[PDB]
Amino acid sequence: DRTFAVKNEDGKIMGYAVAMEGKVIKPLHVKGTIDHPALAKLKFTKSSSYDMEFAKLPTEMKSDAFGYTTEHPEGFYNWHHGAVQFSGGRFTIPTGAGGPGDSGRPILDNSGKVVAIVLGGANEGARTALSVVTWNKKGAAIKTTHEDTVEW
Fold this sequence. Notes:
- The chain is mostly beta strands.
- It folds into 2 domains: 2-66, Thrombin, subunit H; 67-152, Trypsin-like serine proteases (Thrombin, subunit H, Beta Barrel), CATH 2.40.10.10.
- The protein has no helices and 14 strands.
- The active site is at residues 29, 51, 103.
């Protein structure tokens, strides 16, 4: 288990957090507590520029953490709701496949490695371009925001 629900006071899922490369990672706008005993009360460092906050992964996990990859050839990828196309520097899904509550879900290749973290989507009719966080070869974070993005 490597993906965790972020729940508010009522218990409603507001988004998701991932265990990835010695870190706990969740979108900044996603409000609530991570539904996991080892993850609930950690010290988080926030980044408004990239809509991301992170904590040092509890050393009881470690073996349960995603690997990240900087290799995103053009093609199709995996996420909880189906196929994500990567084409022209853009991650897209069919409109309707993603919505509020999906912020924080990872986009994966077939080897099970993370390529991106979902922040939200801009509706373009048939397709929805996903706003994401990726990391370059230098390890630097990149936020890709599209025109008229809806936070999820």
